[PDB]
Amino acid sequence: GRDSLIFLVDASKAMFESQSEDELTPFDMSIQCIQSVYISKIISSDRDLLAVVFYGTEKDKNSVNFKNIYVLQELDNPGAKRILELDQFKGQQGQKRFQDMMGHGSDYSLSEVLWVCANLFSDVQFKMSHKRIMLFTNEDNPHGNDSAKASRARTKAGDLRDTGIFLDLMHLKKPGGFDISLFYRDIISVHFEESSKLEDLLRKVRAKETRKRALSRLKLKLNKDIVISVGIYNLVQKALKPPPIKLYRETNEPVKTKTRTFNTSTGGLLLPSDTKRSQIYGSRQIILEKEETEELKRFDDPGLMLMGFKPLVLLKKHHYLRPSLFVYPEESLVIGSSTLFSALLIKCLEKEVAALCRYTPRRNIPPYFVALVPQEEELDDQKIQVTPPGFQLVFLPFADDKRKMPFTEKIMATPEQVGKMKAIVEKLRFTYRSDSFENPVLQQHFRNLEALALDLMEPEQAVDLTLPKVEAMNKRLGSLVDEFKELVYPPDY
Amino acid sequence: FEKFSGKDPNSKDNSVGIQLLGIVMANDLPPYDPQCGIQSSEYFQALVNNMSFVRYKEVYAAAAEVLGLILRYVMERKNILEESLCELVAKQLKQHQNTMEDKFIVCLNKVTKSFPPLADRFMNAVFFLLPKFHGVLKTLCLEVVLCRVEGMTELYFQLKSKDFVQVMRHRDDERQKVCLDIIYKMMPKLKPVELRELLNPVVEFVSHPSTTCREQMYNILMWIHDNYRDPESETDNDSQEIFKLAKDVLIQGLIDENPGLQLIIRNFWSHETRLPSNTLDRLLALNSLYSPKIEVHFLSLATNFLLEMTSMSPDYPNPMSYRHGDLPDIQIKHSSLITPLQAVAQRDPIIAKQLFSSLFSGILK
Amino acid sequence: CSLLRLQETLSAADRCGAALAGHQLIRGLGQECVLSSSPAVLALQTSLVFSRDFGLLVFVRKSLNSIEFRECREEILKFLCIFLEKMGQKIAPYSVEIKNTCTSVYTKDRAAKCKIPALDLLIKLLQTFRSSRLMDEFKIGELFSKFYGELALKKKIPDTVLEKVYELLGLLGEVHPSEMINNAENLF
C-alpha cells in the first residue's frame, strides 16, 4: 500500500572509479540520482519506502554476511539526517573517503546480489505494493570467466521478476549512453514515454506528491427503485502541503497542545452543554444547538440522485466555481451500471445531455444541486487517459454565484486589429500540455526544507516557467505590440 | 462430479460436493479413472478455479486432498494429465500469492501440505513469503513455516542457514515450535561450523514447554551425533568440539524426567552406541560422562544400567503340609528373583550404597 | 526466574528496541506465566515474579516512548489487567505503585492517544483500574480521581475508547470522599 522503491549501485571494480574520465565517475552521477529520488520523496513525501545499498566491493555492510556488499540504509520513508547521513557521498574527497572508508571494489557475484537487494525486500514489515529497483552500472561484462554466473543471471533473475521484484538499468552513459544491446535482458526487469536520465527524475519530482488514493465511497440512487454506488475521487484537491506542525522551540518536539474550554469568566471550565451555536444580530442574540445546527442540514442523507438530463453545451462558462473533483461511479460492487452507466454515458453524451444530481456530502450536509456531465472515456494505443469514464461533477450555478457581477456598455474593436492580432497570438500561443504546471511558489518552501534535508546553503533553486520569458516575447512576436499600441491610442500608458 | 461440478463465486453449495469429492476420490486411485478428464477434462478446470474461488477456505483441503493426493494418485497409473493441471493450479496459486497477502498463500500452503513433490513454483516465493510473514505475525510461522519447511525437504539445504537464519530465535513462542523442532533433517548437511552456530538454541528454548519438542529434537541430536562420530578420527578438532558439546547436551538428555521413554531410547542408544557390549569398562568410562553432570540421582542411573547389563539374562537361567512344600522353597529352588527385585527396589531410593560395593567389586575385584 | 531472568534480561536487551522480540517475550513468559501455576511454589513464586516485573515494567515501558512498545503494552497491559485478578490483595505495594503507574500510563496515552494501540492502552488500563480497587486507599486514588475526572471531562476522542469518557465517573463514586464527588455530580 505504501510501497518499495530501491537505489542500487553495481560494482565490479572500475565503476566507483571514473573510467578515468574527466567529468565524474558515473558512479557519482548515480550518487546524485539516489539523492534525487530519496530527496524526491521529501517533496512527494511518499509513504513508499526507499533503499540505499551498494555491493561488489571491498568491505561489507549487510546482515547476509558475504563478500562484496554494503547496506547503506534499510527501507525508509526519508529522514533529514538520513539525507545528511548520506550527504557525505558527493565529491572526490567524498568519492574516495566514501570508497575506502567503506572499502571500494574487489569482486562480486550477480544473483547473489539479486537476493541481496531482494532480501532487502525481506526488509518489509509493512504494507507495500510496488517492488521497484534500479541498478547503477556501466558494466558491459558481468563476467566471462564463470558462465555459471551467467546461468545464474538468467536463473535467479526470472525468479526475482517472478518475485514481482523489478530492477532495470537506465541508460547512464557507458559510451554511446551505452553501446551494449546484445545479451542484455536479464539485467533489467496510461500512455507514456521513457527516458535515459535523472534530470527528468529531478524536476519531475521537484513538485510531485501523492499517487494511490481512493477513499470515501458514496452512492447514487438513480430513481427510488434502482441502484448505483458512487466512487468519490480527487483528481486533486488543488493539492496543498501537509501544513505547519506544532513543535516547541528548544525542545523541538511536538507540543501535544490540547484545547478545550475553561470558563473565561470564572476560573472554571466550559462544556459543549454549557454552550451552544448562536447567530446574533442587532438587539437579539439567538442561540441554537450545535446539534440543531448540524441536523438543520438534514434533508435526505449522503448519497446521490439522478435529477435529470441537460444539454451539455447548455452551459459552458456563464459561470464556474469549486470543481468537480472526479467521482467515478463504482462498478464492481454495483455493476450493470457497467452496462447501464456505460450506455448512459454513450447516449447522453450522444444526446449532449447530462445527468443532474443533488449531491449530499459526507455525514450529511445541506445537499446541493450539481450537474453531472457524462465523462467520456479517452484512451490511445497505450491508453493515455485524459477522460476516465465517469461524470464531470458539475456544480450548478446559484444565487451566490451570481450574487453580484456588473453590467454596463461595451465599446468594441475592429477587424483592422484582428488581421494582425491573430498571428500575433500565434506568436503568443503555445501548444501547452498537461505537464509542468503548478504554483511552485509554495514548492519553494519544500525547497527551503530541502535545505535542512541536506543542510546546505541555497536550494535546488530550479526552474519552471510560471513566468514569461522575455527573450521569446520580444523575440518571436517582436514589437508589433507597438502597432497595436498606436492603433487607436497615444497611451502614455 | 457433475452433481458437484459447476459451483461458483460465493457458492457454499460446493461445500458438500467438495467434502465428498475429496472423500470419494480419497478412495484408492479412482478406478477406470475418476473420468475427471475422461468423461470431460475440465472437470479439472472447475475443480481448479473452484479452488481459487474466494476468501472462503473450503477448497483448501479439498483441493489439497485432491491435489496432493492427485499426484500421489497419478503415480500408480498414467501420470500425465494430472500434472500440468497442477501447473494451472499453480498459476492459480502464483496469482493468489501475488494478488493479496495472507489467506491466499497460507491457504495455498496448508493445501500444499499434501502437495509437494515438485517445488519452486511455490518455493522461491515462499522464500520471501514466510519471512515476510514473520512480518505478518502469528501462525504463519505455523501454517506457513510449516508448509514451506516440509516444502524444503530434500536437496534445498544450502541457504537454510540464511532463510532460516532470518527467524527462529525471533520466537520464543511455542506450539508452532514443532517446526523449529521438525526442521532439522540434515544428516550430511550444514556439517561445517555453521551448523553448531545453529545448534546454539537447541536446548535454549526446548527446556520448559511440553517436552514433545525435546522428543524429536534430541532424537536427531542422535542422528547428527553419529554424523559427528569421532572414534580417534579427527575429521577436525572443532568437529569433536561439537561432538562433545553435543555429548554435553546428549547426556543432559540422558536425564529423563516425566517421560521415561526419554531415558529409554536415550539409554538403549547409549548401549549399542555410547557403550560397548561390556560390563567392566562400561563401568569404568561409565563415570566419564558422569563428571559433567553437576546434577543428582544419576548414581541410580549408572547402577540400574549395569543392573540390566550385569545380567541381561544370565540370571534366572543360573538362578542360585504345604509348609513341607515351602521347605524346599526355603531349602532348594532358586535365588534369581532377587536380581530385578533389587534393582527396581533399589532404583527408587535415596542414599543406597550397594551401588558402591558394585563399584569397587566392579573394580577392586 | 526464567520468568524473571528471561523477562528482565531479554526485556532489558529490548531497551534498544524489541518489536516482535519483546512482545512474544511478554507473551510467552507472560502467557506461560499463569498456565504454569502451582500453589506454594508457583503461586507466591509468581508473587515475587509479578512483584518485580511490576517494579520492572513501570520503569521499562514508562521510559519507552510509544513505537513497538505501544504494542508491548498491548501484550503487557492486557496481561496486567488480567493479572489483577491473580491477586485480589497483597496488592498494597503494587496497589499504590501501579496506582500512580497506570496513572502515568493514562499519561502514556497522553503522549500519543488514538491510532490503533493507544485505544488498547487506555482500554486495558480501564479493566486494569477497578478490579484492582479494594477501596483500601483514600487520596492515593482520590488525587488521581480528580484530574482523571478532568482528563475524561473533555477531549474529543474515538467512538471506541469512549468508555473512559465515563470510565471513572462513578468509579470515583466508589471513592467516598466528598468534595471531588461534589465536583463530578455537579459536572456529570
Side-chain angles (χ1 to χ4, degrees), chain B residues 134 170-174 208, chain C residues 2 20 24-25 27-28 32:
Chain B
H134 181 62
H170 287 162
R171 71 176 168 96
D172 61 352
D173 287 345
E174 323 309 323
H208 300 286
Chain C
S2 65
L20 301 175
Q24 65 174 20
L25 173 67
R27 293 183 185 175
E32 288 180 346

Coordinates of all heavy atoms in Angstrom, one line a residue, chain B residues 134 170-174 208, chain C residues 2 20 24-25 27-28 32:
Chain B
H134 N 6.8 -13.6 9.1 CA 7.2 -13.1 10.4 C 6.9 -11.6 10.4 O 6.4 -11.1 11.5 CB 8.8 -13.2 10.6 CG 9.3 -12.7 11.9 ND1 8.9 -13.2 13.1 CD2 10.2 -11.7 12.1 CE1 9.5 -12.5 14.1 NE2 10.3 -11.7 13.5
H170 N 13.6 -15.5 16.6 CA 12.6 -14.5 16.5 C 11.3 -15.0 17.1 O 10.3 -14.2 17.3 CB 12.4 -14.0 15.1 CG 13.5 -13.1 14.6 ND1 13.7 -12.9 13.2 CD2 14.4 -12.4 15.2 CE1 14.7 -12.1 13.1 NE2 15.2 -11.8 14.3
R171 N 11.2 -16.2 17.5 CA 10.2 -16.5 18.5 C 10.7 -17.4 19.6 O 11.4 -18.4 19.4 CB 8.9 -17.2 18.0 CG 9.1 -18.6 17.5 CD 7.7 -19.1 17.1 NE 7.8 -20.4 16.4 CZ 7.7 -21.6 16.9 NH1 7.4 -21.8 18.2 NH2 7.8 -22.6 16.1
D172 N 10.4 -17.0 20.8 CA 10.1 -17.8 22.0 C 8.9 -18.6 21.8 O 8.8 -19.7 22.2 CB 10.0 -17.0 23.2 CG 8.8 -16.0 23.1 OD1 8.2 -15.9 22.0 OD2 8.5 -15.4 24.1
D173 N 7.9 -18.0 21.0 CA 6.6 -18.5 21.0 C 6.5 -19.9 20.5 O 7.4 -20.4 19.9 CB 5.7 -17.6 20.2 CG 5.4 -16.3 20.9 OD1 5.7 -16.2 22.2 OD2 5.0 -15.4 20.3
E174 N 5.4 -20.6 20.9 CA 5.6 -22.0 21.3 C 5.0 -23.0 20.3 O 5.7 -23.4 19.4 CB 4.8 -22.1 22.7 CG 5.0 -20.9 23.6 CD 6.4 -20.4 23.8 OE1 7.3 -21.3 23.9 OE2 6.6 -19.2 23.9
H208 N 11.5 -25.7 29.0 CA 10.3 -25.6 29.8 C 9.0 -26.2 29.2 O 8.2 -26.8 30.0 CB 10.1 -24.2 30.2 CG 11.2 -23.6 31.0 ND1 11.4 -23.9 32.3 CD2 12.2 -22.7 30.7 CE1 12.5 -23.3 32.8 NE2 13.0 -22.5 31.8
Chain C
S2 N 13.5 -18.0 35.1 CA 13.3 -17.9 33.7 C 12.2 -16.9 33.3 O 12.4 -16.1 32.4 CB 13.0 -19.3 33.1 OG 11.7 -19.8 33.6
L20 N 8.8 -7.5 17.7 CA 8.2 -8.9 18.0 C 8.9 -9.5 19.2 O 8.3 -10.1 20.1 CB 8.4 -9.7 16.7 CG 7.6 -9.0 15.6 CD1 7.8 -9.7 14.3 CD2 6.1 -8.9 15.9
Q24 N 6.3 -11.1 22.0 CA 6.2 -12.5 22.3 C 6.9 -12.9 23.6 O 6.4 -13.7 24.3 CB 6.9 -13.3 21.2 CG 8.4 -13.0 21.1 CD 9.1 -13.9 20.1 OE1 8.4 -14.4 19.2 NE2 10.4 -14.0 20.2
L25 N 8.0 -12.2 23.9 CA 8.6 -12.3 25.2 C 7.5 -12.1 26.2 O 7.1 -13.0 26.9 CB 9.7 -11.2 25.3 CG 10.3 -11.0 26.7 CD1 11.1 -12.2 27.1 CD2 11.1 -9.7 26.7
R27 N 4.5 -12.1 25.7 CA 3.6 -13.2 25.6 C 4.1 -14.4 26.4 O 3.5 -14.7 27.4 CB 3.5 -13.6 24.1 CG 2.8 -12.5 23.3 CD 2.7 -13.0 21.9 NE 2.2 -12.1 20.9 CZ 2.1 -12.2 19.6 NH1 2.4 -13.4 19.1 NH2 1.6 -11.3 18.9
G28 N 5.1 -15.0 26.0 CA 5.4 -16.3 26.4 C 5.6 -16.3 27.9 O 4.7 -16.9 28.7
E32 N 2.6 -18.0 29.3 CA 3.0 -19.2 30.0 C 3.3 -18.9 31.5 O 3.6 -19.8 32.2 CB 4.3 -19.8 29.4 CG 4.0 -20.5 28.0 CD 5.3 -21.1 27.4 OE1 6.4 -20.7 27.9 OE2 5.2 -21.9 26.5

